Amino acid sequence: RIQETQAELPRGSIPRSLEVILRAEAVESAQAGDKCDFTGTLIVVPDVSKLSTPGARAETNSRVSGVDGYETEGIRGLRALGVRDLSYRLVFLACCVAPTNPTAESIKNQMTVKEWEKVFEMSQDKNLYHNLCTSLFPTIHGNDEVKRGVLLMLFGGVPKTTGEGTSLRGDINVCIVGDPSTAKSQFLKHVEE
Amino acid sequence: LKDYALEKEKVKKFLQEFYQDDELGKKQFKYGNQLVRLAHREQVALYVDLDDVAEDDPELVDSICENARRYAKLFADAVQELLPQYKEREVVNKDVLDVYIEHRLMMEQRSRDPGMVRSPQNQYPAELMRRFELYFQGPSSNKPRVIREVRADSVGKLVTVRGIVTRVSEVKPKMVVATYTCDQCGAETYQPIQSPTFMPLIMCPSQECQTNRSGGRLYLQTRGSRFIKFQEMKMQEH
Ligand SMILES: Nc1ncnc2c1ncn2[C@@H]1O[C@H](COP(=O)(O)OP(=O)(O)O)[C@@H](O)[C@H]1O
Numbered sequence: 001r002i003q004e005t006q007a008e009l010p011r012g013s014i015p016r017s018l019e020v021i022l023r024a025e026a027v028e029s030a031q032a033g034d035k036c037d038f039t040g041t042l043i044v045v046p047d048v049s050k051l052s053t054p055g056a057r058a059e060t061n062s063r064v065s066g067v068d069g070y071e072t073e074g075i076r077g078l079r080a081l082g083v084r085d086l087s088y089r090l091v092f093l094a095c096c097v098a099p100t101n102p103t104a105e106s107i108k109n110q111m112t113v114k115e116w117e118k119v120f121e122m123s124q125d126k127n128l129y130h131n132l133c134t135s136l137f138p139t140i141h142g143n144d145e146v147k148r149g150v151l152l153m154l155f156g157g158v159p160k161t162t163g164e165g166t167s168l169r170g171d172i173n174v175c176i177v178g179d180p181s182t183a184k185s186q187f188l189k190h191v192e193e
Numbered sequence: 194l195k196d197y198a199l200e201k202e203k204v205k206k207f208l209q210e211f212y213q214d215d216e217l218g219k220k221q222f223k224y225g226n227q228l229v230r231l232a233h234r235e236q237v238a239l240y241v242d243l244d245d246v247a248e249d250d251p252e253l254v255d256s257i258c259e260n261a262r263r264y265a266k267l268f269a270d271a272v273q274e275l276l277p278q279y280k281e282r283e284v285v286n287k288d289v290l291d292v293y294i295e296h297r298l299m300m301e302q303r304s305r306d307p308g309m310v311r312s313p314q315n316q317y318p319a320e321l322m323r324r325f326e327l328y329f330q331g332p333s334s335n336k337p338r339v340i341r342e343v344r345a346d347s348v349g350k351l352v353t354v355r356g357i358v359t360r361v362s363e364v365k366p367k368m369v370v371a372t373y374t375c376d377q378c379g380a381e382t383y384q385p386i387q388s389p390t391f392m393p394l395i396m397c398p399s400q401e402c403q404t405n406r407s408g409g410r411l412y413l414q415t416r417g418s419r420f421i422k423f424q425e426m427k428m429q430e431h
């Protein structure tokens with residue numbers, strides 16, 4: 001199942017939902033929560049309980065009439081002429097699925113030479129501690145402690161397990177309490193973006 | 194049991210008779226004026242008082258009370274037969290339904306010779322051409338009943354009730370007679386409705402389709418159909 005994104009919403013409208021079908025190799029990809037582009041076809045599939053009122057329907061061209069004792073009444077007449085209700089729904093078949101915007105060895109191999117050059121340039125800078133604070137939060141004034149804490153939470157720690165069957169946390173949790181208008185929701189919005 | 198022809202004649206003479214009551218202090222032909230208005234589209238329903246009938250014949254009133262539906266139908270037919278007599282002019286302004294009725298009567302006169310044999314199925318339904326409704330007013334001598342005490346003994350009778358309204362349904366059209374057109378002929382088929390649900394037809398009973406054995410198939414039409422105003426009411430005791 002896929003959903004229309006927020007940027008495509010018109011005034012006062014709920015996002016549209018659509019069904020996508022994957023066949024064979026393309027079945028693997030497109031996990032839940034992703035934001036992806038699809039390329040394929042738009043195809044019509046029949047439906048059953050759409051018509052509570054009579055609508056378009058099919059029949060046979062043969063000019064056949066009933067005989068006494070076998071008169072083409074309701075049920076028998078409909079079954080004899082092969083009448084089917086024409087109901088339909090729209091379904092999308094996908095042949096290509098891609099990310100809208102795109103195991104350490106695998107990550108290293110995926111990156112190109114220029115991307116790896118940029119990564120290495122970033123790696124050996126002490127100002128990485130400072131510049132990352134200003135880059136993610138350019139407009140918010142002060143509160144550098146909160147920026148450092150949020151960056152540390154983003155990078156996170158290492159999880160471990162012990163021999164007795166217990167487990168140890170590797171994640172970090174952060175709480176912010178403040179007076180009104182102290183840019184408290186701006187950090188949340190920036191991290192969401 | 195009594196034959197319906199005699200009572201139909203009695204109904205006709207009762208409708209033709211009364212001169213008595215007038216509001217302005219005179220003697221006025223009330224039912225004649227009502228019928229003249231009914232001739233054109235200046236009145237689309239008629240109410241009959243069962244107190245006025247009681248002057249000449251009470252047995253008619255009792256039979257109406259116990260067998261109300263049959264007498265309603267008889268009254269409708271009697272008034273429909275009386276309508277041509279009182280007619281004096283053609284319609285000044287008419288709507289779609291009148292256009293169908295006039296056209297159908299005109300082609301009936303065009304085609305049907307007086308001597309040719311006509312099948313009982315070949316006639317028009319009575320209520321399709323009719324456009325007036327008849328209703329009854331409860332007798333003043335009759336005492337209104339209570340919702341709790343109407344039971345199987347009262348099924349089919351004429352009753353008068355007093356109550357409080359709690360639920361009313363929005364107005365929606367109700368089917369009276371359905372009209373069908375064949376796929377390969379100019380004939381028209383009529384299906385009366387007297388059930389909460391009905392099954393639409395398929396094949397054409399028209400004579401030409403039968404003679405050719407063409408197997409033409411019917412289609413519904415909404416313009417030719419007859420519809421009535423229908424509402425549902427809920428009442429409770431005081
Ligand atoms: N230190 C700051 N630097 C820049 N803008 C700020 C700062 N403090 C407050 N603001 C502005 O004031 C508003 C604060 O509202 P908000 O952060 O939603 O308050 P709260 O999160 O406490 O409900 C924001 O729109 C922000 O633009």
Ligand SMILES: [Mg+2]
Pocket residue numbers: 184185
């Ligand atoms: Mg806030």
Ligand SMILES: [Zn+2]
Pocket residue numbers: 374375376377378379380397398399402409
């Ligand atoms: Zn036909």
